[PDB]
Design a protein around this ligand. Structure first.
Ligand SMILES: Nc1ncnc2c1ncn2[C@@H]1O[C@H](COP(=O)(O)OP(=O)(O)NP(=O)(O)O)[C@@H](O)[C@H]1O
Ligand SMILES: Nc1ncnc2c1ncn2[C@@H]1O[C@H](COP(=O)(O)OP(=O)(O)NP(=O)(O)O)[C@@H](O)[C@H]1O
Ligand SMILES: [Co+2]
Ligand SMILES: [Co+2]
Ligand SMILES: [Co+2]
Ligand SMILES: [Co+2]
Ligand SMILES: [Mg+2]
Ligand SMILES: [Mg+2]
Lengths: 588, 601
């Protein structure tokens, strides 16, 4: 029932030829200029990266062979002629370098320059170019490209091409030191001769480029890359400002984490938690490399549950896809994500100590993210890492006070290893749980979990600290029996039981067996319990025969009042008209 | 004030030299091997695509019998991945010029149909992502013609020799590097095929077993798809176990080529997943928004030939075409859902109940008014002019509006009975306008954001009641003056209430607009106040001096003054709750029980 035709039936017969791999130059240029980037606008990123690199090499040269000029990138638009022009005052290119570097695809002068530096040299970490293709991005948007270049050594040149397999080189006066590139834009790309549009692209990708960038004689990039600076030389106001820019936000960060490290990758990063809680009516952490935008929404570097963080991650040696808008599959990027997960958890844990009050607000607003993380990850070790961030209330603690799974594990009786919880809409329904009343008597402490999805979190948690979480789950004696028998008939299809109990000020209360049910209800088999010493109950007893119609309203009210006190009816609008009838008739 | 450096100053001196662009081949190979594809597994897709193309070329040549299939083999002991197709094969010139030359694609000069996948001339080199060594055995058809072995380590050179025992077609053997042993696992290779190549037009066999490849339903004639084929296909694309309640199979050629199928699940959406969905294809191979956020409940697939692919085959290439496509799809889906409401309103009611929250979200988070209104066409309400239970729409409301009218009135209450008997509705009934009844939690927020519809302002009943004070209060009471407090009694009572409720209310007023209710709370921007409470104000308390409870209060203030104050506090609380402006109701229960006992003697 198997069908395979793969068989070792081949044998080397005779002699063989040796060939070198070739490359169809014509088609390859078309591929860069058409089939490489998701957006045409990206040619501006590339040309500015080149200007930065040229400037960086000049700066490097002058450390040793010092000499004389300012280091700048200038952009000019001409909306009448349809041109885009960029000029840098960097190292420039002689005729040999124009032909070699521009004329040859995947040849990178910058890459060779990098490979020859001491790894410690500043330029080692700021040179952007790697592949030797970014320049061809100009043909995506231009029918004609002209390059004027003057090297810093001992004649100016003009390089020229339409990008169709050929190019021309001639001597030129009077070219300024560095390189000037003029793009004659295609008709469908004339938008890049608009100043406003070019400004949008520069700020998107290249806002943190190290050298001043001018557009039509005006400076743009006034924003310094805070993530590359020493964490201590940065003030709270700089973070507030930088946060707003990077998160496109208008509030401040409640938390700031400035993380720098060298392994598995170079990392310079800043993470923020917004002060404003998120909701339905609605950026992410951005990825950079050597100060250039890679992805506005970084995908592989953080786990999904940490998507509430804003900010930036920059790595010098993260493996980039050729398009420079994706990362390659890498064991190093996987390790980075794991490292960051642990760092952020560690940071939030520290914060729960420094200010439990503040952390309490944070957990109310963002705790859902932690719960999601515990449910969706498949690593038990990490589930218990994220679980250190959870807060609940406890049977063994007062109302409104939070504790962690660790603090519970702390207080446990020495001879036991079970974590008991009870997921309830509220505390009243918890304290009066049949299942919890059990754990009151013989057993001891139970976690009260009121938040949404607290349940399946713990179900998915399964195991914490090698331990197991498991859900713990007046009126005479015949005047009352008469009253009860009456009550069961007026509330036939509302409750599945009516009891009598020792309540004080409250004439009745609602209790529920399954908390699980009550959630379906709020999305039920209540048990009303009557205080036969309460005046309204004794009044109810008297009116059931004397004024049956009045006692019907009163009964309904006592039931509704009990459901409200149990948090089982949060919006009492349905009762108001009846209640008003009860009041008018009572007040005759 | 300006700093520029760019000046038209440069002039050419003497003649030019002419040059041809060149390529650094060795470094291109490295780029294809390490930097081109973001995921290693796609070498499987690329090799299958080549096999599929070779088979298409043979099919086209066989017109003008033999099997046409693709075989995969994993050897986890030898660390080897093998693929063999029964296609046209390659001759010596072909092995050299097409395989040996990066960016050379024989699958171009073949033209000359739309079944051919290969375009760039680089896909084959993806093998070097995962393999130290690659051997190729190919046999052309017919044509003369010898067999050949092609061989390379991936760096720089390769060798070809004539060979025997080469079956018609092409076999390729990947000697996997230690980094990539996962591709000698059958379960692993199977995962990849079904991910990218599950709609390939020829059978694929893995280690002798035929893979369950599928029909590209979206490309096919809609009328030839049975409900059951859609059920199955839905379950596949949505990875679900239930079936679709709606199926939209959309083809178009203008303005954009589009072949798509969308499904709405029969299941209600998980509330967990809502806070925490359509695949994109080209030529039957997977490609990795397209729908606006509010339509993320839809499942299914979109294919469009106007979307260009990047070199790596994982990104789309015109962020403006996409916005267009998305706008087209949004429009088509709204029209589809409007049509479903016509055909079967009862079934649509269930849909709206389960998914309505997505519409409301869409209305609230869009900035474009015409889009808010388009989505708003999907909303359903009840009406004061229709029997209980009968759903209607903004459009139908608009069509009943008299010539003079210029506003759409609405009232938000938990249910039909509460709206019909709302004090706000009693007040509105004195006018002759139709009032929409909206029962869902975020309906008010939604209409607040919607603001207007078809040039008609949306106004809540509660708001309209306040505005009428600043016009003519030309309304007469429901009860004759005999059944009301005299003015002197009304003024006396009000002055008392103002003292008893000093810092809780802005003012207190009688109103002729109530019947069943003793009082109501009014706030100009009621809706916005309700929304704000979900985490005081300048509320007005308006009393009905014809109501038994109000008149009794007038008496009580002079007979049991303490009881009168307790009554007063409760009336205010009742009006706040009825207004939807109440804080936690639990702490009022104490007062209420106390009030209840003192009343009952
Ligand atoms: N503005 C410039 N000034 C001086 N030299 C330049 C300039 N632009 C490009 N070059 C040179 O031309 C080469 C080719 O540029 P490019 O095609 O962008 O490849 P790359 O910058 O080297 N690497 P990549 O950007 O990752 O593809 C560079 O490496 C430099 O040697
Ligand atoms: N299995 C095969 N059988 C026959 N010819 C093949 C086979 N694989 C590759 N070829 C030939 O070799 C050429 C190069 O393949 P490839 O590098 O994948 O580029 P491409 O398929 O043409 N376009 P693309 O896949 O989009 O990069 C193809 O165009 C075919 O002419
Ligand atoms: Co052999
Ligand atoms: Co070195
Ligand atoms: Co000139
Ligand atoms: Co009309
Ligand atoms: Mg470059
Ligand atoms: Mg191919």
């Amino acid at each position: 029932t198997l069908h395979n035709i793969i068989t070792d039936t081949e044998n080397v017969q005779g002699s063989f030829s040796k060939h070198e791999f070739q490359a169809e130059t014509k088609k390859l240029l078309d591929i860069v200029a058409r089939s490489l980037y998701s957006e045409k606008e990206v040619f501006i990123r590339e040309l500015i990266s080149n200007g930065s690199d040229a400037l960086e090499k000049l700066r490097h040269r002058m450390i040793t062979a010092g000499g004389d000029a300012p280091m700048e990138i200038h952009l000019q638009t001409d909306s009448v002629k349809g041109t885009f022009t960029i000029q840098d005052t960097g190292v420039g290119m002689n005729k040999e370098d124009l032909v070699s570097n521009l004329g040859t695809i995947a040849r990178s002068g910058s890459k060779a320059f990098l490979d020859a530096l001491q790894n410690q040299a500043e330029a080692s970490s700021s040179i952007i170019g790697q592949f030797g293709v970014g320049f061809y991005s100009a043909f995506m948007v231009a029918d004609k490209v002209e390059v004027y270049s003057q090297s810093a050594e001992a004649p100016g040149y003009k390089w020229s091409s339409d990008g169709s397999g050929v190019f021309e080189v001639a001597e030129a006066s009077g070219v300024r030191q560095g390189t000037k590139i003029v793009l004659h834009l295609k008709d469908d790309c004339k938008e890049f001769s608009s100043e406003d549009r070019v400004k949008e692209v520069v700020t998107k990708y290249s806002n943190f480029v190290s050298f001043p960038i001018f557009l039509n004689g005006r400076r743009l990039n006034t924003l310094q890359a805070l993530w590359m600076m020493e964490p201590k030389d940065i003030s709270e106001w700089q973070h507030e400002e930088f946060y707003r820019y990077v998160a496109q936000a208008y509030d401040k960060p409640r938390y700031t984490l400035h993380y720098r490290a060298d392994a598995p990758l170079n990392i310079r990063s800043i993470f923020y938690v917004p002060e404003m809680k998120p909701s339905m009516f609605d950026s992410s952490v951005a990825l950079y490399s050597r100060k250039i935008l890679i992805q506005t929404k970084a995908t592989d570097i953080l786990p999904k549950w940490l998507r509430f963080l804003r900010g930036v991650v920059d790595s010098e040696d993260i493996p980039l896809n050729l398009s420079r808008e994706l990362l390659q599959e890498s064991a190093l990027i996987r390790k980075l994500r794991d490292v960051l997960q642990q760092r952020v958890i560690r940071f939030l844990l520290d914060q729960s100590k420094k200010d439990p009050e503040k952390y309490a607000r944070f957990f109310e607003d963002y705790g859902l993210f932690m719960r999601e993380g515990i449910v969706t990850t498949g690593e038990q070790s990490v589930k218990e890492d994220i679980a250190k961030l959870l807060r609940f209330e406890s049977s063994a603690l007062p109302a409104g006070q939070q504790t962690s799974l660790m603090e519970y594990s702390s207080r446990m009786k020495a001879g036991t290893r079970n974590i008991y919880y009870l997921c309830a809409p509220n505390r009243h329904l918890a304290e009066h749980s049949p299942y919890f009343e059990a754990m009151k008597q013989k057993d001891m402490e139970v976690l009260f979990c009121f938040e949404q999805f607290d349940e399946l979190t713990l179900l998915h948690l399964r195991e914490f600290d090698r331990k197991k979480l498991i859900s713990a789950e007046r009126l005479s004696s015949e005047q009352a029996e008469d009253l009860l028998a009456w009550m069961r008939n007026a509330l036939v299809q509302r409750v599945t039981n009516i009891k009598v109990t020792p309540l004080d000020t409250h004439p009745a209360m609602i209790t529920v067996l399954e908390m699980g049910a009550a959630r379906h209800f709020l999305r039920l088999q209540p048990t009303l319990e009557i205080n036969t010493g309460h005046d309204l109950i004794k009044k109810l007893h008297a009116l059931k025969d004397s004024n049956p119609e009045l006692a019907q309203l009163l009964l309904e009210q006592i039931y509704d009042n009990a459901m409200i006190a149990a948090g089982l009816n949060e919006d009492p609008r349905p009762m108001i008209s009846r209640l008003n009838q009860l009041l008018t008739r009572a007040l005759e």
